[PDB]
Short mmCIF file of C-alpha atoms and ligand atoms in Angstrom, two decimals:
data_model
loop_
_atom_site.label_atom_id
_atom_site.label_comp_id
_atom_site.label_asym_id
_atom_site.label_seq_id
_atom_site.Cartn_x
_atom_site.Cartn_y
_atom_site.Cartn_z
CA UNK A 7 -66.08 39.63 -13.21
CA UNK A 8 -65.11 42.79 -15.11
CA UNK A 9 -62.09 45.09 -15.51
CA UNK A 10 -61.44 48.70 -16.54
CA UNK A 11 -58.68 51.25 -15.88
CA UNK A 12 -59.40 53.11 -12.64
CA UNK A 13 -56.59 55.70 -12.56
CA UNK A 14 -56.26 56.56 -8.83
CA UNK A 15 -52.92 57.76 -7.47
CA UNK A 16 -53.11 58.01 -3.67
CA UNK A 17 -52.25 54.94 -1.59
CA UNK A 18 -53.48 53.83 1.85
CA UNK A 19 -51.53 50.57 1.89
CA UNK A 20 -49.08 51.49 4.71
CA UNK A 21 -46.74 49.02 2.96
CA UNK A 22 -42.98 49.29 2.62
CA UNK A 29 -39.01 44.48 7.69
CA UNK A 30 -38.20 42.32 4.66
CA UNK A 31 -35.26 44.42 3.48
CA UNK A 32 -32.44 43.70 5.94
CA UNK A 33 -34.13 40.46 7.01
CA UNK A 34 -33.94 39.04 3.49
CA UNK A 35 -30.24 39.39 4.21
CA UNK A 36 -30.60 36.38 6.52
CA UNK A 37 -31.69 34.31 3.51
CA UNK A 38 -28.44 35.05 1.69
CA UNK A 39 -26.35 34.32 4.77
CA UNK A 40 -27.96 30.93 5.27
CA UNK A 41 -27.17 30.49 1.58
CA UNK A 42 -23.47 31.22 1.94
CA UNK A 43 -23.43 29.15 5.13
CA UNK A 44 -24.41 26.18 2.99
CA UNK A 45 -21.45 26.80 0.68
CA UNK A 46 -18.73 26.37 3.29
CA UNK A 47 -19.29 22.64 4.01
CA UNK A 48 -19.88 22.02 0.30
CA UNK A 49 -16.66 23.75 -0.81
CA UNK A 50 -14.56 22.00 1.83
CA UNK A 51 -15.95 18.64 0.75
CA UNK A 52 -15.20 19.28 -2.90
CA UNK A 53 -11.53 20.05 -2.15
CA UNK A 54 -11.20 17.03 0.13
CA UNK A 55 -12.85 14.56 -2.25
CA UNK A 56 -10.87 15.87 -5.19
CA UNK A 57 -7.55 15.52 -3.41
CA UNK A 58 -8.40 12.07 -2.02
CA UNK A 59 -8.95 11.01 -5.61
CA UNK A 60 -5.55 12.47 -6.52
CA UNK A 61 -3.71 10.87 -3.60
CA UNK A 62 -5.39 7.50 -4.19
CA UNK A 63 -3.58 7.08 -7.52
CA UNK A 64 -0.33 7.22 -5.55
CA UNK A 65 0.00 3.66 -4.11
CA UNK A 66 2.44 4.50 -1.27
CA UNK A 67 1.46 8.06 -0.37
CA UNK A 68 -0.30 7.44 2.92
CA UNK A 69 -3.95 8.28 2.63
CA UNK A 70 -4.07 4.51 3.01
CA UNK A 71 -3.06 4.79 6.67
CA UNK A 72 -6.56 6.16 7.34
CA UNK A 73 -7.65 2.53 7.03
CA UNK A 74 -6.55 1.10 10.39
CA UNK A 75 -7.41 -2.59 10.05
CA UNK A 76 -5.50 -2.96 6.76
CA UNK A 77 -2.40 -1.00 7.72
CA UNK A 78 -2.58 -3.27 10.76
CA UNK A 79 -2.89 -6.25 8.46
CA UNK A 80 0.04 -5.13 6.30
CA UNK A 81 2.24 -4.44 9.34
CA UNK A 82 1.43 -7.94 10.60
CA UNK A 83 1.99 -9.38 7.12
CA UNK A 84 5.46 -7.85 6.74
CA UNK A 85 6.37 -8.74 10.34
CA UNK A 86 5.68 -12.46 9.81
CA UNK A 87 7.69 -12.47 6.56
CA UNK A 88 10.78 -10.76 8.03
CA UNK A 89 10.92 -13.24 10.93
CA UNK A 90 10.50 -16.24 8.65
CA UNK A 91 13.10 -14.96 6.20
CA UNK A 92 15.65 -14.52 8.98
CA UNK A 93 15.09 -18.09 10.19
CA UNK A 94 15.59 -19.33 6.65
CA UNK A 95 18.79 -17.28 6.52
CA UNK A 96 20.30 -18.78 9.66
CA UNK A 97 19.39 -22.26 8.45
CA UNK A 98 20.98 -21.50 5.07
CA UNK A 99 23.94 -20.07 6.95
CA UNK A 100 24.64 -23.16 9.07
CA UNK A 101 23.98 -25.63 6.25
CA UNK A 102 26.57 -23.85 4.13
CA UNK A 103 29.44 -24.23 6.57
CA UNK A 104 28.42 -27.88 6.91
CA UNK A 105 28.80 -28.18 3.16
CA UNK A 106 32.29 -26.70 3.16
CA UNK A 107 34.03 -28.42 6.08
CA UNK A 108 35.89 -31.46 4.63
CA UNK B 6 15.12 0.01 23.17
CA UNK B 7 11.46 0.77 23.74
CA UNK B 8 10.14 0.75 20.15
CA UNK B 9 11.31 -2.66 19.12
CA UNK B 10 10.73 -4.74 22.24
CA UNK B 11 7.03 -3.98 21.83
CA UNK B 12 7.41 -4.80 18.14
CA UNK B 13 9.01 -8.17 18.89
CA UNK B 14 6.33 -8.98 21.48
CA UNK B 15 3.67 -8.43 18.81
CA UNK B 16 5.56 -10.48 16.20
CA UNK B 17 5.91 -13.37 18.65
CA UNK B 18 2.15 -13.37 19.25
CA UNK B 19 1.61 -13.61 15.49
CA UNK B 20 3.14 -17.09 15.51
CA UNK B 21 1.73 -18.06 18.91
CA UNK B 22 -2.06 -18.10 18.53
CA UNK B 23 -1.95 -20.21 21.69
CA UNK B 24 -1.02 -17.39 24.09
CA UNK B 25 0.93 -20.01 26.04
CA UNK B 26 4.26 -18.39 25.19
CA UNK B 27 5.49 -21.19 22.95
CA UNK B 28 5.92 -21.70 19.20
CA UNK B 29 5.53 -25.25 17.85
CA UNK B 30 6.19 -26.60 14.36
CA UNK B 31 2.48 -26.72 13.50
CA UNK B 32 2.22 -23.10 14.60
CA UNK B 33 5.06 -22.09 12.28
CA UNK B 34 3.80 -24.38 9.52
CA UNK B 35 0.39 -22.73 9.70
CA UNK B 36 1.79 -19.22 9.24
CA UNK B 37 3.85 -20.27 6.22
CA UNK B 38 0.94 -22.21 4.73
CA UNK B 39 -1.32 -19.20 5.20
CA UNK B 40 1.20 -17.17 3.17
CA UNK B 41 0.81 -19.61 0.27
CA UNK B 42 3.93 -21.64 0.99
CA UNK B 43 4.22 -25.41 1.29
CA UNK B 44 7.00 -26.33 3.76
CA UNK B 45 7.71 -29.81 5.15
CA UNK B 46 8.20 -31.18 8.66
CA UNK B 47 11.99 -31.42 8.10
CA UNK B 48 12.37 -27.76 7.05
CA UNK B 49 10.22 -26.62 9.98
CA UNK B 50 12.29 -28.81 12.29
CA UNK B 51 15.45 -27.18 10.93
CA UNK B 52 14.04 -23.68 11.27
CA UNK B 53 13.03 -24.32 14.87
CA UNK B 54 16.21 -26.21 15.82
CA UNK B 55 18.25 -23.18 14.73
CA UNK B 56 16.25 -20.92 17.02
CA UNK B 57 15.47 -23.18 20.00
CA UNK B 58 18.54 -23.25 22.20
CA UNK B 59 17.36 -25.39 25.11
CA UNK B 60 16.36 -28.41 23.02
CA UNK B 61 12.71 -28.65 24.07
CA UNK B 62 11.51 -28.60 20.47
CA UNK B 63 9.80 -25.22 20.71
CA UNK B 64 10.65 -21.51 20.91
CA UNK B 65 10.01 -19.17 23.84
CA UNK B 66 10.14 -15.37 23.82
CA UNK B 67 13.71 -15.04 25.15
CA UNK B 68 14.89 -17.53 22.47
CA UNK B 69 12.93 -15.48 19.90
CA UNK B 70 14.62 -12.24 20.99
CA UNK B 71 18.09 -13.76 20.73
CA UNK B 72 17.60 -14.54 17.04
CA UNK B 73 16.17 -11.10 16.32
CA UNK B 74 19.06 -9.47 18.15
CA UNK B 75 21.49 -11.78 16.37
CA UNK B 76 24.14 -10.13 14.18
CA UNK B 77 23.84 -10.31 10.39
CA UNK B 78 25.80 -7.32 9.11
CA UNK B 79 28.97 -8.64 10.64
CA UNK B 80 32.72 -8.82 9.92
CA UNK B 81 32.56 -12.63 9.60
CA UNK B 82 29.38 -13.36 7.63
CA UNK B 83 29.80 -11.08 4.63
CA UNK B 84 32.89 -13.21 4.12
CA UNK B 85 30.60 -16.23 4.50
CA UNK B 86 28.46 -14.82 1.68
CA UNK B 87 31.40 -13.76 -0.50
CA UNK B 88 32.80 -17.29 -0.69
CA UNK B 89 29.37 -18.61 -1.57
CA UNK B 90 29.76 -16.33 -4.57
CA UNK B 91 33.24 -17.78 -5.08
CA UNK B 92 31.68 -21.21 -5.61
CA UNK B 93 30.04 -20.16 -8.87
CA UNK B 94 33.00 -18.06 -10.06
CA UNK B 95 35.35 -20.23 -12.16
CA UNK B 96 37.86 -17.71 -13.54
CA UNK B 97 39.32 -16.71 -10.16
CA UNK B 98 38.92 -12.92 -9.97
CA UNK B 99 35.94 -10.91 -8.78
CA UNK B 100 33.26 -10.90 -11.50
CA UNK B 101 30.36 -13.30 -11.98
CA UNK B 102 28.49 -13.24 -15.29
CA UNK B 103 25.24 -11.27 -15.33
CA UNK B 104 23.50 -14.10 -17.20
CA UNK B 105 25.01 -16.65 -14.84
CA UNK B 106 23.58 -14.84 -11.81
CA UNK B 107 20.01 -15.01 -13.15
CA UNK B 108 20.46 -18.72 -13.83
CA UNK B 109 21.61 -19.69 -10.33
CA UNK B 110 19.24 -17.28 -8.56
CA UNK B 111 16.14 -18.49 -10.43
CA UNK B 112 16.95 -22.19 -10.94
CA UNK B 113 18.73 -23.24 -7.73
CA UNK B 114 18.05 -23.43 -3.98
CA UNK B 115 15.08 -21.34 -2.89
CA UNK B 116 14.76 -20.33 -6.51
CA UNK B 117 13.71 -16.69 -6.99
CA UNK B 118 11.33 -14.82 -9.26
CA UNK B 119 12.61 -13.03 -12.36
CA UNK B 120 11.22 -9.77 -10.98
CA UNK B 121 13.28 -10.34 -7.82
CA UNK B 122 16.52 -10.84 -9.76
CA UNK B 123 15.64 -7.83 -11.87
CA UNK B 124 15.79 -5.94 -8.59
CA UNK B 125 19.22 -7.48 -7.96
CA UNK B 126 20.42 -6.61 -11.46
CA UNK B 127 19.22 -3.00 -11.33
CA UNK B 128 20.61 -2.80 -7.84
CA UNK B 129 23.70 -3.87 -9.77
CA UNK B 130 24.45 -1.18 -12.33
CA UNK B 131 27.66 -3.03 -13.21
CA UNK B 132 28.50 -4.27 -16.71
CA UNK B 133 31.82 -4.64 -18.50
CA UNK B 134 29.39 -5.76 -21.15
CA UNK B 135 27.28 -7.91 -18.89
CA UNK B 136 29.11 -8.67 -15.70
CA UNK B 137 28.46 -8.19 -12.02
CA UNK B 138 31.20 -7.70 -9.42
CA UNK B 139 29.96 -9.55 -6.35
CA UNK B 140 31.88 -8.04 -3.44
CA UNK B 141 30.13 -4.75 -4.11
CA UNK B 142 26.85 -6.66 -3.69
CA UNK B 143 27.73 -8.25 -0.38
CA UNK B 144 28.72 -4.82 0.96
CA UNK B 145 25.35 -3.56 -0.27
CA UNK B 146 23.61 -6.27 1.70
CA UNK B 147 25.99 -5.35 4.56
CA UNK B 148 25.78 -1.73 5.62
CA UNK C 32 43.14 -40.58 -6.36
CA UNK C 33 39.88 -42.50 -6.76
CA UNK C 34 38.52 -40.82 -3.61
CA UNK C 35 37.69 -37.86 -5.88
CA UNK C 36 34.09 -39.03 -6.20
CA UNK C 37 33.78 -38.30 -2.48
CA UNK C 38 35.52 -34.95 -2.88
CA UNK C 39 33.32 -33.99 -5.84
CA UNK C 40 30.05 -35.15 -4.28
CA UNK C 41 31.21 -33.03 -1.36
CA UNK C 42 31.37 -30.05 -3.70
CA UNK C 43 28.09 -31.13 -5.29
CA UNK C 44 26.35 -30.38 -2.01
CA UNK C 45 28.02 -26.97 -1.82
CA UNK C 46 26.29 -25.56 -4.89
CA UNK C 47 22.71 -25.71 -3.50
CA UNK C 48 24.00 -24.44 -0.17
CA UNK C 49 25.81 -21.43 -1.67
CA UNK C 50 22.83 -20.52 -3.86
CA UNK C 51 20.48 -20.62 -0.85
CA UNK C 52 22.79 -18.47 1.28
CA UNK C 53 22.77 -15.77 -1.41
CA UNK C 54 19.02 -16.01 -1.85
CA UNK C 55 18.17 -15.98 1.86
CA UNK C 56 20.54 -13.07 2.46
CA UNK C 57 19.09 -10.96 -0.33
CA UNK C 58 15.48 -11.72 0.61
CA UNK C 59 16.32 -10.29 4.05
CA UNK C 60 17.79 -7.25 2.30
CA UNK C 61 14.78 -6.88 -0.02
CA UNK C 62 12.37 -7.28 2.90
CA UNK C 63 13.49 -4.12 4.73
CA UNK C 64 12.37 -2.16 1.70
CA UNK C 65 8.54 -2.00 1.84
CA UNK C 66 7.67 -1.10 -1.77
CA UNK C 67 10.50 -2.62 -3.74
CA UNK C 68 8.55 -5.85 -3.93
CA UNK C 69 9.76 -9.24 -3.09
CA UNK C 70 6.21 -9.03 -1.64
CA UNK C 71 4.65 -9.67 -5.03
CA UNK C 72 5.64 -13.33 -4.53
CA UNK C 73 2.76 -13.52 -2.02
CA UNK C 74 -0.14 -13.84 -4.45
CA UNK C 75 -3.29 -13.76 -2.36
CA UNK C 76 -2.11 -10.80 -0.26
CA UNK C 77 -1.00 -8.81 -3.30
CA UNK C 78 -4.43 -9.50 -4.76
CA UNK C 79 -5.99 -8.49 -1.44
CA UNK C 80 -4.13 -5.17 -1.74
CA UNK C 81 -5.21 -4.53 -5.34
CA UNK C 82 -8.78 -5.42 -4.35
CA UNK C 83 -8.51 -3.03 -1.43
CA UNK C 84 -7.21 -0.06 -3.48
CA UNK C 85 -9.75 -0.75 -6.24
CA UNK C 86 -12.66 -0.52 -3.81
CA UNK C 87 -11.33 2.74 -2.39
CA UNK C 88 -10.68 4.46 -5.72
CA UNK C 89 -14.25 3.72 -6.81
CA UNK C 90 -15.78 4.81 -3.51
CA UNK C 91 -13.65 7.94 -3.33
CA UNK C 92 -14.94 9.19 -6.69
CA UNK C 93 -18.60 8.48 -6.03
CA UNK C 94 -18.01 10.79 -3.07
CA UNK C 95 -16.37 13.28 -5.43
CA UNK C 96 -19.30 13.43 -7.82
CA UNK C 97 -21.67 13.79 -4.87
CA UNK C 98 -19.50 16.60 -3.50
CA UNK C 99 -19.42 18.02 -7.04
CA UNK C 100 -23.21 18.20 -7.45
CA UNK C 101 -23.87 19.40 -3.90
CA UNK C 102 -21.50 22.30 -4.47
CA UNK C 103 -23.26 23.33 -7.68
CA UNK C 104 -26.53 23.55 -5.78
CA UNK C 105 -24.88 25.53 -2.98
CA UNK C 106 -23.64 28.05 -5.56
CA UNK C 107 -26.95 28.40 -7.42
CA UNK C 108 -29.26 31.13 -5.99
CA UNK D 4 -9.01 6.71 -23.29
CA UNK D 5 -9.80 3.00 -23.57
CA UNK D 6 -7.54 -0.02 -23.69
CA UNK D 7 -7.77 -3.81 -23.32
CA UNK D 8 -7.51 -4.50 -19.58
CA UNK D 9 -8.86 -1.13 -18.53
CA UNK D 10 -12.07 -3.01 -19.18
CA UNK D 11 -11.07 -6.20 -17.37
CA UNK D 12 -9.99 -3.92 -14.54
CA UNK D 13 -13.46 -2.43 -14.11
CA UNK D 14 -15.16 -5.81 -14.49
CA UNK D 15 -13.33 -7.05 -11.43
CA UNK D 16 -14.00 -3.80 -9.53
CA UNK D 17 -17.73 -4.17 -10.20
CA UNK D 18 -17.63 -7.71 -8.81
CA UNK D 19 -16.05 -6.45 -5.58
CA UNK D 20 -19.20 -4.48 -4.74
CA UNK D 21 -21.53 -7.09 -6.22
CA UNK D 22 -21.08 -10.23 -4.11
CA UNK D 23 -24.43 -11.15 -5.65
CA UNK D 24 -23.28 -12.10 -9.14
CA UNK D 25 -26.61 -10.66 -10.27
CA UNK D 26 -25.02 -7.66 -11.97
CA UNK D 27 -26.56 -5.31 -9.43
CA UNK D 28 -25.11 -3.02 -6.76
CA UNK D 29 -27.56 -2.13 -3.98
CA UNK D 30 -27.14 0.23 -1.03
CA UNK D 31 -26.62 -2.78 1.25
CA UNK D 32 -24.01 -3.99 -1.23
CA UNK D 33 -22.28 -0.59 -1.13
CA UNK D 34 -22.88 0.00 2.57
CA UNK D 35 -21.20 -3.29 3.42
CA UNK D 36 -18.02 -2.47 1.47
CA UNK D 37 -17.63 0.90 3.21
CA UNK D 38 -18.60 -0.66 6.56
CA UNK D 39 -16.30 -3.58 5.82
CA UNK D 40 -13.28 -1.33 6.08
CA UNK D 41 -13.78 0.82 7.71
CA UNK D 42 -15.98 3.87 8.02
CA UNK D 43 -19.55 4.44 9.26
CA UNK D 44 -21.86 5.66 6.46
CA UNK D 45 -25.48 6.14 7.51
CA UNK D 46 -28.32 4.62 5.50
CA UNK D 47 -28.39 8.06 3.87
CA UNK D 48 -25.21 9.17 2.00
CA UNK D 49 -25.45 5.79 0.23
CA UNK D 50 -28.54 6.65 -1.83
CA UNK D 51 -26.89 9.93 -2.78
CA UNK D 52 -23.81 8.04 -3.87
CA UNK D 53 -25.93 5.57 -5.85
CA UNK D 54 -28.35 8.17 -7.27
CA UNK D 55 -25.35 10.02 -8.71
CA UNK D 56 -24.29 6.83 -10.49
CA UNK D 57 -27.64 5.19 -11.25
CA UNK D 58 -28.95 6.82 -14.42
CA UNK D 59 -32.16 4.87 -15.08
CA UNK D 60 -33.54 5.49 -11.60
CA UNK D 61 -34.20 1.92 -10.51
CA UNK D 62 -32.30 2.48 -7.28
CA UNK D 63 -29.33 0.28 -8.17
CA UNK D 64 -26.25 0.22 -10.39
CA UNK D 65 -25.51 -2.17 -13.27
CA UNK D 66 -22.16 -2.52 -15.09
CA UNK D 67 -22.84 -0.05 -17.93
CA UNK D 68 -23.87 2.59 -15.36
CA UNK D 69 -20.66 1.71 -13.50
CA UNK D 70 -18.67 2.19 -16.70
CA UNK D 71 -20.29 5.54 -17.43
CA UNK D 72 -19.03 6.86 -14.10
CA UNK D 73 -15.36 6.01 -14.76
CA UNK D 74 -15.69 7.06 -18.38
CA UNK D 75 -16.52 10.37 -16.71
CA UNK D 76 -13.33 12.33 -15.82
CA UNK D 77 -11.78 15.16 -13.71
CA UNK D 78 -8.75 16.58 -15.49
CA UNK D 79 -9.94 16.29 -19.08
CA UNK D 80 -12.72 18.76 -18.33
CA UNK D 81 -13.66 22.06 -16.82
CA UNK D 82 -14.32 21.49 -13.11
CA UNK D 83 -10.84 22.70 -12.49
CA UNK D 84 -12.77 25.98 -12.34
CA UNK D 85 -15.37 24.39 -10.08
CA UNK D 86 -12.66 23.43 -7.59
CA UNK D 87 -11.14 26.87 -8.01
CA UNK D 88 -14.29 28.71 -6.95
CA UNK D 89 -14.59 26.34 -4.00
CA UNK D 90 -11.19 27.70 -2.98
CA UNK D 91 -12.37 31.28 -3.52
CA UNK D 92 -14.95 30.73 -0.78
CA UNK D 93 -12.21 30.64 1.85
CA UNK D 94 -9.91 33.28 0.33
CA UNK D 95 -11.02 36.56 1.91
CA UNK D 96 -8.31 38.92 0.66
CA UNK D 97 -9.06 38.38 -3.02
CA UNK D 98 -5.45 37.49 -3.79
CA UNK D 99 -4.81 34.04 -5.23
CA UNK D 100 -3.35 32.93 -1.91
CA UNK D 101 -4.94 31.18 1.03
CA UNK D 102 -3.16 31.04 4.39
CA UNK D 103 -1.20 27.85 5.10
CA UNK D 104 -2.67 27.60 8.60
CA UNK D 105 -6.15 28.29 7.26
CA UNK D 106 -5.85 25.38 4.84
CA UNK D 107 -4.89 23.17 7.79
CA UNK D 108 -8.12 24.16 9.50
CA UNK D 109 -10.57 23.70 6.63
CA UNK D 110 -9.08 20.39 5.54
CA UNK D 111 -9.09 18.90 9.04
CA UNK D 112 -12.09 20.49 10.75
CA UNK D 113 -14.70 20.74 7.97
CA UNK D 114 -16.58 18.46 5.58
CA UNK D 115 -15.08 14.99 5.26
CA UNK D 116 -12.29 15.86 7.74
CA UNK D 117 -8.88 14.86 6.34
CA UNK D 118 -6.20 13.56 8.70
CA UNK D 119 -3.14 15.51 9.92
CA UNK D 120 -0.78 13.35 7.87
CA UNK D 121 -2.92 13.80 4.77
CA UNK D 122 -2.71 17.61 4.86
CA UNK D 123 1.02 17.30 5.49
CA UNK D 124 1.12 15.66 2.06
CA UNK D 125 -0.89 18.57 0.68
CA UNK D 126 1.55 20.97 2.35
CA UNK D 127 4.71 19.23 1.15
CA UNK D 128 3.25 18.95 -2.33
CA UNK D 129 2.74 22.69 -1.86
CA UNK D 130 6.32 23.98 -1.77
CA UNK D 131 4.89 27.49 -1.52
CA UNK D 132 5.54 30.00 1.28
CA UNK D 133 6.11 33.73 1.61
CA UNK D 134 4.50 33.91 4.98
CA UNK D 135 3.29 30.60 3.94
CA UNK D 136 1.44 31.16 0.69
CA UNK D 137 -0.21 28.22 -1.05
CA UNK D 138 -1.42 29.66 -4.34
CA UNK D 139 -4.51 27.48 -4.76
CA UNK D 140 -4.31 27.87 -8.55
CA UNK D 141 -1.28 25.60 -8.73
CA UNK D 142 -2.96 23.07 -6.39
CA UNK D 143 -5.89 22.93 -8.79
CA UNK D 144 -3.74 22.12 -11.83
CA UNK D 145 -1.71 19.71 -9.72
CA UNK D 146 -4.83 17.63 -9.17
CA UNK D 147 -5.70 18.08 -12.85
CA UNK D 148 -3.05 16.93 -15.35
CA1 CA E 201 2.29 -22.28 21.86
CA1 CA E 202 12.32 -23.69 24.10
CA1 CA E 203 -26.35 -7.59 -6.33
CA1 CA E 204 -29.61 1.31 -12.66
#
């Protein structure tokens, strides 16, 4: 439990494969960046596109596009029936 | 055509939850009630009687196809529409008042929402000062 | 010409009929156009849409902020 | 930045995730909405999502925490430069341009995997081509306005 300056130059440490193998550390590090950068671009754009109500990033939701396509289909059919009824009833109304 | 036959087959199934290949009034009434509408047995009878051609009271798939394939954009029926417009036109020529249109569209028949007749009126883009020429409209509906 | 009451009541039934023909014809025209909304007259489904898009917009930005933070860590040595 | 029914808007949005009425959004609450329609988030991902919103660290979100997140913004800030350097990762040449076909790859085959039709939208919003060019600096300030 003491300490004083020893002043000895020669070294028998045999010390310096951590040089080009610490490379690996900074390749793993860049390898992490690729998924992260791709995700940032994707999530940013999907926030942009989402503000556009018709621009189809909404088609990625299958059930609801389904549901809309079924919704519109029912309406068109009904509306055409109502038309043909309104059509016949009008020429009834006109014939003396 | 390929596209649309498949489309019609799917639309038919939307009204026929039964899978039996028939569409009854209660089937049709259910679809319209699900869409927030309140139709009556008479109106449903009328709707079906205009589609059902064999008089059995219900609609099959061939009968359904015939109505979907039925003409609408035709030489005869845009003249049927034009004279409906002529009913409301007193003067005799071809304009109906812009204010008058909103009145009859929103307060008569099936009625109509103000946002819907806004769409009509901006689909218009005609005004002497406030006047819509109706034959242009019928030819818009008929292209 | 007393039989004018019959001829007028005849016309009286023409007015609702004409109005309906115009309305049913246009609603077929408006229906082919998917955004142009005669579809806003269907309340519960329009609400269902607004509820749908609301949920997405919220979700999509939680995912943004997660993607945001995860990128900042990926950049930091 | 704040109006009348911007607030009523968010109050309803909060209630869409909280079927509880308790004023709390849990992972099961969030997981259900995503699983409702229509994707498959693991039991992970959800905590991350919530931990980025939850600021008092009790594992769930209340309405003020929900407000803070949408008070938060993308275009009004710098983070345009955060997106930019995410683009620089893929640009090898050093020029401000990334290949049109390369963008197709990274948007569809990496990360959250966008659809083909989605990147078409990106590419038509692009309107940039020498070979095909896509200066990602204009894409950045397109998203941020
Ligand atoms: Ca049946
Ligand atoms: Ca039949
Ligand atoms: Ca709750
Ligand atoms: Ca909290």
